[PDB]
Design a protein around this ligand. Sequence first.
Ligand SMILES: CNc1nc2cc(C(=O)NN)ccc2[nH]1
Ligand SMILES: CNc1nc2cc(C(=O)NN)ccc2[nH]1
Ligand SMILES: [Zn+2]
Ligand SMILES: [Zn+2]
Lengths: 368, 368
Amino acid sequence: RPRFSFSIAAREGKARTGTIEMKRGVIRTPAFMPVGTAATVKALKPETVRATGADIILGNTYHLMLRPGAERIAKLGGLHSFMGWDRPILTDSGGYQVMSLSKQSEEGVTFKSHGSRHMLSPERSIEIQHLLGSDIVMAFDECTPYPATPSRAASSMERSMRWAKRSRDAFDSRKEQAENAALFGIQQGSVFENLRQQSADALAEIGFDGYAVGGLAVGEGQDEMFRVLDFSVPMLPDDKPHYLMGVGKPDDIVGAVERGIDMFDCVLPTRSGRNGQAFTWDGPINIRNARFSEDLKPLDSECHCAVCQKWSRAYIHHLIRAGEILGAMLMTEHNIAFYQQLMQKIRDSISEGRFSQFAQDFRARYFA
Amino acid sequence: RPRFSFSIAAREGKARTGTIEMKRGVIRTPAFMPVGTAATVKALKPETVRATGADIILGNTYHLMLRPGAERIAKLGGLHSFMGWDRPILTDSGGYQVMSLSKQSEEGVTFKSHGSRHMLSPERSIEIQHLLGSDIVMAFDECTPYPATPSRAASSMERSMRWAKRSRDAFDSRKEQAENAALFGIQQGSVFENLRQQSADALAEIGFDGYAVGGLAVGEGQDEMFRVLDFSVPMLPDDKPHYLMGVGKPDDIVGAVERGIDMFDCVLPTRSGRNGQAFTWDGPINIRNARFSEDLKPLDSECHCAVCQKWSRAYIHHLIRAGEILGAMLMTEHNIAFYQQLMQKIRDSISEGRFSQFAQDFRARYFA
Ligand SMILES: CNc1nc2cc(C(=O)NN)ccc2[nH]1
Ligand SMILES: CNc1nc2cc(C(=O)NN)ccc2[nH]1
Ligand SMILES: [Zn+2]
Ligand SMILES: [Zn+2]
């Protein structure tokens, strides 16, 4: 089993499909990572996450360093053993959650807990991810809020590229990490094509196993996100995976794949599932709506998940309206399974040379 | 498959062990019924409930008639189909929850929802339980609060015995119910031996498939409950099952079996599981306690449940402290499995003629 081996098996336009082989398993691309921020994918056992088709999940440096603590997780055997997920885990490096939930300098950032005071830096972020035992480690960078000025973007991007170098060196200075895990760099530059190019060149100069597109899914709109992707993804090394952080709605994922993205993560299927939103091929539905009170059909008429094989909309309606935990469990399992079936349909259509048609057919029905 | 067939396979003192055969399955006695008040055993899929060893679960007439409604559940195919549990279901008849959560007469009771106004009577309670499709139907009675006067007890008991007759006739007047389901009567009389005898005679005069001991688990203390059981259970027909409603803690169950009880129900393993209390053979523990933050052992060192095979105390500690749904799921599955292993140990020890020794050994270690 290799440390990190990305193969592209088929292409169509800018879209690609293939695999990433790692020590703890194979990751089919394009891939969706369920989010497991507090060492759990909310309301699901790891076996259920795997059953839906997930190959890899996402954990969070910022959250786990606060609770229950990275030194503690290391002492208890690592994140995989701690939560019972034995497949690959990607860990965000803490930059986006420091800005979103929690005194910056060139050395790093000090911040207050969501409330004690804590510190993060490129070297400290990489060491926490070693302690957690992450398989895909993210370089630590400095995010700037949206809609950032053109100067707030260039300053955050330039620093992030210097921090990308220190992340590389810290990772490479840890033998167990460099031999068993992989390191991704994060392209910044906001919506500015020249800054995105400068970021891409700096990251390719350093050299990473994969490249993320940062600074999107921040309230910019899909048209702007698609516009930024149009020129930004072709700047990244073609032969490495492309990871769009924080995205997104089903139609966002399809358009992003059409533009060359290989990996995705978003809290939407879990979070909105608990809120009562179920994804279907005819678009989302709110299972709390009174129209579902006596609807015996499954959540989606085609879905293969265990929820749609056993329980009705009317039952899940009742559960969510009564605030029952089982309602959150069933809604979440269905939504994560819907996302995985979507990625499977994308992978199959690219490999068969009919992804353009699939995308057109998908949007025609989903937005009907 | 018979409608209702209770066999006693072995005895020891007053304790008995055996089976109840019903159309939807076999119920091993002494039995513990997990409580599924809102058409769900809280935080568990029915398959997980069955995995822990449960043969039968309990539903609630008062709750289901309010939400989502009994006529509705009937229209959607019945309670079994609605929630996905295809084995026996016992339904409490609504008397205790009317008094506890929600204008009485000889005809019945009118009350306000937990908030519209609603009505219950012996005939209306039996019809709701038919609509739900319950396998074991409970007679509708009139509970009086604890610590009831000697006059509040005799008046509630006498009315309950008249209501037990109307429940019998309403059940018997419904052909599908009388042929496929069973009917239990509820002994009342508070702590008064003469009233308990009058209740027992009236119920045996009518004739039921089983007999419950009502009016306990109301804040009377275990010594008083055991005292009431000492004379009350021998008043019931020996050849029918004896059901102690609302009980209870592990040591309550053992002492109750020693006194002739065959069936049990309590929210304690589910409710206190969500609150962080885990049952072990060395007594309960609060998994939130800081002493468990780095404890890699399972919840209980002997437990056979899937939770104790996979996850540590330290992980479940973290989950419950973060308010994670998975914490409630794992705590609940372990507690219900612990209860079922307790009943299995009771059944095995009675059948082997060593239940007295088991009870002594159990209490010595549980209260150490
Ligand atoms: C949900 N939106 C969203 N945007 C993100 C951006 C980043 C980023 O630029 N990290 N360096 C990370 C996670 C994100 N999640
Ligand atoms: C938890 N305690 C508890 N006591 C109960 C008494 C009755 C009763 O007398 N019904 N007729 C029913 C359920 C109970 N649950
Ligand atoms: Zn589904
Ligand atoms: Zn266990």
